[PDB]
Amino acid sequence: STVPLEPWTAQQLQQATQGYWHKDQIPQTEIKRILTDSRHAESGDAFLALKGERFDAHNFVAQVVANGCQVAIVERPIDAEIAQLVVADTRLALGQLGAYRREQNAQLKVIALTGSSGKTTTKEMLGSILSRLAPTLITRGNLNNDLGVPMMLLELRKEHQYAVMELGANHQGEIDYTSKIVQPHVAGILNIGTAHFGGRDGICRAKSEIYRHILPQGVAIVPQQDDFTAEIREAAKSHQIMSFGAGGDVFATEIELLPQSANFQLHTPQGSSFVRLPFAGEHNVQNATAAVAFALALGVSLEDIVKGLEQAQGAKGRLNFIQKTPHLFIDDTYNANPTSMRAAAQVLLQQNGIKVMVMGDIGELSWQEHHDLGRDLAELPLDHIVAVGQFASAALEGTKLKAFQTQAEALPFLINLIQTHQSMSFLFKGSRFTHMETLMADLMEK
């Protein structure tokens, strides 16, 4: 990474991993950064060599030596001029290094959260709330798995008073592993979504591992309106509990959905407040109520929580409203599924001007799915539907909808829509692998 980092001593590296220095060659200078990318390691870094499926970064140690790196963390001694901390397993050692740094920072109050949807948005909301009060570390991008979580904890500094760790795992045992490294004071689940083997039951059990390592006198956060609310409350029973959602501790009433925001009355065990939330859509109201519950569990005042929500900003590709007078471009390109795709159309339906929904394929599904999506969206009063990809033909089945196999062929059509019409409102969305944000940037170019 590239943020300011607190250095490591050779002694700290060894103590965290219980490794040994090869041939007793011990670095006499401090280590400024631990990284896994052989392209970027330089003088002062420690290169930690990971292996995985058909890959082994031990193969690239000569590259980091040629580039000036003089410290490596490895599973086996390499014949090279570099100090080497030898460990049994470098994936485990990375976990231990993150766990050690988390433990050394005893001043921290720590949140861990998971869920099928809304993790990143809820994390950003908490980040806004907590960063107003003190230095706060939150998960960057998708660093939320067995490697990403400890990589994030390496960025902890003595100045940090708060940490908000997103945990992304979906499979049995994975959340136990990362949440044990994190050692949260407050943790919980936002929702259980649709089936990925194991079924939704398996997803529930996996994410319920997040309650196992909550620290003494901590708090478990539970969703009060989930299909698995009762099972999740049982999983959290060894901890003090707070809930969010209708019928729960923290909930919203008189919700008003505006074109780029949402108004509602917020209710909590610490009092109530109106909230002018600068996020669009009912799902983001739900994410706000979860952030409120997490923040109250850390003792933040309701007043500071509302101030944090009202100035919070969304992650990239999550309903970003981009004004390009006299046109609007909504960037919702981060990902897609059949449910969220229909939800996005509802947001576009609230905008002024000629409404054009540009959509790419939805993965992990498929033909019948797009057939019904193209049918349902065509019944909506959208002005134009531009379907791009391998299943655009399916959506065409069931004037309003045009289908393109490639983006290259879709770009002139979108350009022609400008000419054919008067302000336009575009919304762009597709699964991550379709990266519809290039087609959006390409239309915006001119």
Ligand X SMILES: Nc1ncnc2c1ncn2[C@@H]1O[C@H](COP(=O)(O)OP(=O)(O)NP(=O)(O)O)[C@@H](O)[C@H]1O
- From Mg ion, ligand X, none, which one binds at residue 150 (CB under 5 to 8 Å depending on kind)? none
Binding window for Mg ion (CB under 5 A); candidates: 63-71, 119-127, 154-162, 220-228: 119-127
For the segment 388-427, give every residue that binds ligand X (CB under 6 A). none
- From Mg ion, ligand X, none, which one binds at residue 283 (CB under 5 to 8 Å depending on kind)? ligand X
Rounded distance, CA 164 to CA 145, Å?
14
CA atoms within 13 A on the CB side of 181: 29
Q: Shortest Cβ contact with ligand X: which residue? A: 118
Binding of ligand X by 121 (CB under 6 A): yes
Least Å from the CB of residue 91 to Mg ion:
21
Which of residues 194 and 420 has its CB atom nearest to ligand X in the complex? Answer: 194
Other C-beta atoms within 10 Å of 210: how many? 28
Binding of Mg ion by 119 (CB under 5 A): yes
For the segment 14-33, give every residue that binds Mg ion (CB under 5 A). none
For the segment 96-115, give every residue that binds ligand X (CB under 6 A). 115
Distances (CA, A) of 175 to 166, 185, 189, 212: 11, 16, 11, 9
Least Å from the CB of residue 142 to ligand X:
6
Contacts for 89 with CB less than 8 Å, ≥ 6 apart: 75
Question: With contact defined as beta carbons under 8 Å apart, do 313 and 125 qualify?
Answer: no
Binding of ligand X by 178 (CB under 6 A): no
Question: With contact defined as beta carbons under 8 Å apart, do 261 and 351 qualify?
Answer: no
Binding of ligand X by 118 (CB under 6 A): yes
Binding of Mg ion by 283 (CB under 5 A): no
Q: Write the interaction track for Mg ion spanning residues 212-251; mark x where CB under 5 A is met and - where it is not.
A: ----------------------------------------
For the segment 312-371, give every residue that binds ligand X (CB under 6 A). 315, 318, 332, 334-335, 340, 343
Q: Write the interaction track for ligand X spanning residues 123-162; mark x where CB under 6 A is met and - where it is not.
A: -------------------x--------------------
- From Mg ion, ligand X, none, which one binds at residue 102 (CB under 5 to 8 Å depending on kind)? none
In 3D space, the residue among 74, 91, 57 whose CA is nearest the CA of residue 23 turns out to be 74
CA atoms within 13 A on the CB side of 413: 19
- From ligand X, Mg ion, none, which one binds at residue 286 (CB under 5 to 8 Å depending on kind)? ligand X
Candidates 90, 120, 208, 224; binder of Mg ion (CB under 5 A) is 120
Least Å from the CB of residue 435 to ligand X:
14
Which of residues 84 and 121 has its CB atom nearest to Mg ion in the complex? Answer: 121
| Residue 373, φ and ψ in degrees, nearest 5 | -65, -50
Which of residues 96 and 122 has its CB atom nearest to ligand X in the complex? Answer: 122
Binding window for ligand X (CB under 6 A); candidates: 118-126, 145-153, 291-299, 433-441: 118-126
Least Å from the CB of residue 114 to ligand X:
8
Binding window for ligand X (CB under 6 A); candidates: 89-97, 119-127, 269-277, 293-301: 119-127
Candidates 98, 127, 148, 168; binder of ligand X (CB under 6 A) is 168
Which of residues 25 and 320 has its CB atom nearest to ligand X in the complex? Answer: 320
Candidates 22, 33, 102, 119; binder of ligand X (CB under 6 A) is 119
Core vs surface per residue 226-241: b (16+ CB within 10 A) or e: bebbeebbebbeebeb
- From Mg ion, ligand X, none, which one binds at residue 188 (CB under 5 to 8 Å depending on kind)? none
Cα dihedral across residues 377, 378, 382, 386: positive or negative: positive
For the segment 252-291, give every residue that binds ligand X (CB under 6 A). 283, 286-287
Question: With contact defined as beta carbons under 8 Å apart, do 412 and 386 qualify?
Answer: no
Question: With contact defined as beta carbons under 8 Å apart, do 126 and 291 qualify?
Answer: yes
Q: Write the interaction track for ligand X spanning residues 181-220; mark x where CB under 6 A is met and - where it is not.
A: ---------xx-----------------------------
Binding of ligand X by 120 (CB under 6 A): yes
Q: Which residues bind ligand X (CB under 6 A)?
A: 115, 117-121, 142, 168, 190-191, 283, 286-287, 315, 318, 332, 334-335, 340, 343
Q: Which residues bind Mg ion (CB under 5 A)?
A: 119-120
